[PDB]
Amino acid sequence: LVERLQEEKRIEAQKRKERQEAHLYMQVQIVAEDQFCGHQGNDMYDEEKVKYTVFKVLKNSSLAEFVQSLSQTMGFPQDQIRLWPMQARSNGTKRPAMLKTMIELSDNENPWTIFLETVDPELAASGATLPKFDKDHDVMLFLKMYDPKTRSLNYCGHIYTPISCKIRDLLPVMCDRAGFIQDTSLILYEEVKPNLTERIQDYDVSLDKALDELMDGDIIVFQKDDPENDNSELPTAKEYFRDLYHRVDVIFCDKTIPNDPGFVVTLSNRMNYFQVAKTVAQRLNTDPMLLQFFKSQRDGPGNPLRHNYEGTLRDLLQFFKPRQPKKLYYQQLKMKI
Amino acid sequence: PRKCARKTR
Ligand SMILES: [Cl-]
Ligand SMILES: [Cl-]
Ligand SMILES: [Cl-]
């Protein structure tokens, strides 16, 4: 007790000095390209699913300090890395941007997230190096290949190119990264923002003119022109991103089975009662009639939803916060008595 | 030719 009661005072002493100091510090979240592979969504990665390396850094510390700590921590030379701060934009995108105190560089943002380009350690073992970047005449671009058969996106890395380069001149690389033959016919889009995927028509103009509002971190999506895919449910990247925009995963818990973890169903925000009900039924091998849904409140099932509801799944889900997992309670009614 | 400094739509 005697020496035990001193340690309980030492712990409250150290934990209060840290509470006071915590305003002097900021999070820097380092995200690495390997996290972009497999991402099926808009922009480069999912904020929630991605995995960061995390740095606790004095707000008024310098960049050079961070870089040094960074290169030594991560195990790279200082001149074999490039920092591309992630920038939340007004149009609803977050993108690597181009790059005094850390906090002023983050534009007061905290946590600050940064895309750290490095060389692939495998390829660097055989003499690969960080390519240089004329911050004025070059642009960094991201490539995605859409496959209409599987209706999926396939990250195809990034490229450094002179801004003055023709779109046509990039086709060989897209074809190659996608595993296609040179001079395979491609349809190209700028992924602009969610629900905006503009086709690029003139391939014989510079990148400044081809994309609207050209910046580093811009994304071009491409795809074959295979006829077998006219058949497909989402024949183009444009249509794929539209489907995605209106997409939502909802968890359905059976109110009568308490603590039922429930199951996830992928629905559309622009569905109606019938569509919602019918989908969930096909999952349970039952009749839509036999399902009663309850509204969303608190945690717990709310008021019962009436089957003549005229609204949309959006309307039902409009009281959920961005990070909140979307859940609706239901229960099953009897066929006979 | 140049990059834009900011998006606006
Ligand atoms: Cl809409
Ligand atoms: Cl629909
Ligand atoms: Cl009533």
Numbering used by the authors:
A (entry chain A): 540 to 638, 646 to 843, 846 to 885
B (entry chain D): 618 to 626
Relevant lines from the article:
Ubiquitin specific protease 7 (USP7) catalyzes the deubiquitination of many cellular proteins involved in tumor suppression, neural stem cell maintenance, DNA damage and immune responses. USP7 consists of an N-terminal TRAF-like domain (NTD), a catalytic domain (CAT) and five C-terminal ubiquitin-like domains (CTD). In fact USP7 was first discovered through its strong and specific interaction with the ICP0 protein of HSV-1, leading to its original name of Herpesvirus Associated USP (HAUSP). The fact that several proteins bind to the C-terminal ubiquitin-like domains of USP7 prompted us to identify and characterize the interaction mechanism. This study shows the structural basis of interaction between the first three C-terminal ubiquitin-like domains complexed with an ICP0 peptide, revealing a protein binding pocket at Ubl2 of USP7-CTD.
Crystals were only obtained with Ubl123 and ICP0 peptide 617GPRKCARKTRH627. The crystal structure of Ubl123-ICP0 peptide complex was determined to 2.9 Å resolution. The ICP0 peptide binds to a predominantly negatively charged area between 758DELMDGD764 on Ubl2. The two ICP0 lysine residues (K620 and K624) function like a pair of tongs by forming salt-bridges with two buried aspartate residues of USP7 (D762 and D764). These two lysine residues belong to the central part of the peptide (KCARKT), which is in close contact with USP7 due to a backbone-to-backbone hydrogen bond (ICP0 nitrogen-C621 with USP7 oxygen-L760). Interestingly, native Ubl123 crystallized in a previously unknown compact conformation with a direct contact between Ubl1 and Ubl3. A superposition of all available USP7 fragments containing Ubl123 shows two distinct orientations of Ubl3 compared to Ubl12 with a 35 degree motion and a pivot at residue H792. The only strong hydrogen bond between Ubl2 and Ubl3 is formed between the protein backbone of residues H792 and N814. In the compact conformation S814 has moved to the former position of N815, thereby tilting the entire Ubl3 domain against Ubl12. The compact conformation appears to be stabilized by a salt bridge between R871 of Ubl3 and D587 of Ubl1. In the compact conformation of Ubl123, the distance between the catalytic domain and Ubl45 is drastically reduced from 75 Å (extended conformation) to 50 Å.
